[PDB]
Amino acid sequence: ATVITTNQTGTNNGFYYSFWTDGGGSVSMTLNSGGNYSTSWTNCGNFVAGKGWSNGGRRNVQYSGSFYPSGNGYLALYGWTSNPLVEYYIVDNWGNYRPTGTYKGTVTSDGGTYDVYQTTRYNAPSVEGTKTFNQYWSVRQSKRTGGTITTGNHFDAWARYGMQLGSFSYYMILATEGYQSSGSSNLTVSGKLA
Numbered sequence: 506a507t508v509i510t511t512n513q514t515g516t517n518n519g520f521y522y523s524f525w526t527d528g529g530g531s532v533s534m535t536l537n538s539g540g541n542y543s544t545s546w547t548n549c550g551n552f553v554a555g556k557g558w559s560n561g562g563r564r565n566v567q568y569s570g571s572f573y574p575s576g577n578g579y580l581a582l583y584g585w586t587s588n589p590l591v592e593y594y595i596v597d598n599w600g601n602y603r604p605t606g607t608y609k610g611t612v613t614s615d616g617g618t619y620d621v622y623q624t625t626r627y628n629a630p631s632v633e634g635t636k637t638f639n640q641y642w643s644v645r646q647s648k649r650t651g652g653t654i655t656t657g658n659h660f661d662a663w664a665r666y667g668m669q670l671g672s673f674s675y676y677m678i679l680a681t682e683g684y685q686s687s688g689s690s691n692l693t694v695s696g697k698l699a
């Protein structure tokens with residue numbers, strides 16, 4: 506295993522990984538065999554970390570494990586596009602704070618119903634540095650840790666609702682995120698191209 510406490514991307518046991526923190530509190534990620542990783546955080550600022558793929562795409566993502574936020578955290582299939590720059594989230598779990606914004610309708614996927622939202626961040630950290638970009642969200646109506654995420658179901662619903670993705674030129678990870686919170690996660694990802 507490899508313990509990560511510093512911003513970086515790379516490959517571990519056949520999976521891409523990304524770790525980003527604003528540097529608040531205490532945040533680590535442990536990289537284990539295959540698609541396994543855990544995180545531990547105490548009074549974080551903001552972080553996003555997980556395993557997945559160097560480029561996004563239509564993928565039947567399978568994951569399992571545990572996600573235990575004390576306060577604000579997200580469990581999401583997470584990544585980015587270029588042209589346009591979009592930060593996208595398919596959220597299966599959260600803590601005290603449910604992501605919201607401009608409501609666009611619902612999509613049904615992997616045994617659940619998801620609420621679709623768009624938000625915008627101005628001059629914020631991104632995979633292209635300080636940038637303005639839209640965020641696309643699918644938020645499950647009931648919390649869970651584990652199952653299939655059919656990314657194609659979400660991408661197609663976003664497209665019907667006028668939320669067009671750019672090119673899958675950046676990573677797509679099964680992410681743990683925290684905001685001014687504590688917690689842990691212990692997750693395994695895999696998944697094949699649909």
Ligand SMILES: OC[C@@H]1O[C@@H](O[C@@H]2[C@@H](O)[C@H](O[C@@H]3CO[C@@H](O[C@@H]4CO[C@@H](O)[C@H](O)[C@H]4O)[C@H](O)[C@H]3O)OC[C@H]2O[C@@H]2OC[C@@H](O)[C@H](O)[C@H]2O)[C@H](O)[C@H]1O
Nearest residue numbers: 512513514523525551553592626629630631632633634635
């Ligand atoms: O990973 C090693 C580092 O890469 C270089 O710096 C930049 C990375 O920090 C950046 O990472 C992004 C930053 O944004 C994160 O998304 C945040 C997370 O919270 C969300 O809720 C919020 O909306 C959002 O703002 C995202 O998770 C991270 O993946 O990736 C880009 C990188 O900068 C680029 O480096 C290459 C260069 O060609 C570009 O000009 C430059 O912008 C550092 O070198 C190193 O620390």
Ligand SMILES: [Cl-]
Nearest residue numbers: 508509510511
């Ligand atoms: Cl490190």
Ligand SMILES: [Cl-]
Nearest residue numbers: 514515516517
């Ligand atoms: Cl590496």
Ligand SMILES: [Cl-]
Nearest residue numbers: 516517518519
């Ligand atoms: Cl390795």
Ligand SMILES: [Cl-]
Nearest residue numbers: 516517518519
């Ligand atoms: Cl590897």
Ligand SMILES: [Cl-]
Nearest residue numbers: 521557558559
């Ligand atoms: Cl990959």
Ligand SMILES: [Cl-]
Nearest residue numbers: 571572573650
């Ligand atoms: Cl859990």
Ligand SMILES: [Cl-]
Nearest residue numbers: 606607608609
């Ligand atoms: Cl709304």
Ligand SMILES: [Cl-]
Nearest residue numbers: 607608609623
């Ligand atoms: Cl809108």
Ligand SMILES: [Cl-]
Nearest residue numbers: 609610611612
């Ligand atoms: Cl609807």
Ligand SMILES: [Cl-]
Nearest residue numbers: 617618646647
């Ligand atoms: Cl549901």
Ligand SMILES: [Cl-]
Nearest residue numbers: 606623624625
């Ligand atoms: Cl907004």
Ligand SMILES: [Cl-]
Nearest residue numbers: 624626629640
């Ligand atoms: Cl944000």
Ligand SMILES: [Cl-]
Nearest residue numbers: 623625639667
């Ligand atoms: Cl827009």
Ligand SMILES: [Cl-]
Nearest residue numbers: 646647648649
């Ligand atoms: Cl629930």
Ligand SMILES: [Cl-]
Nearest residue numbers: 572598649650
């Ligand atoms: Cl759970």
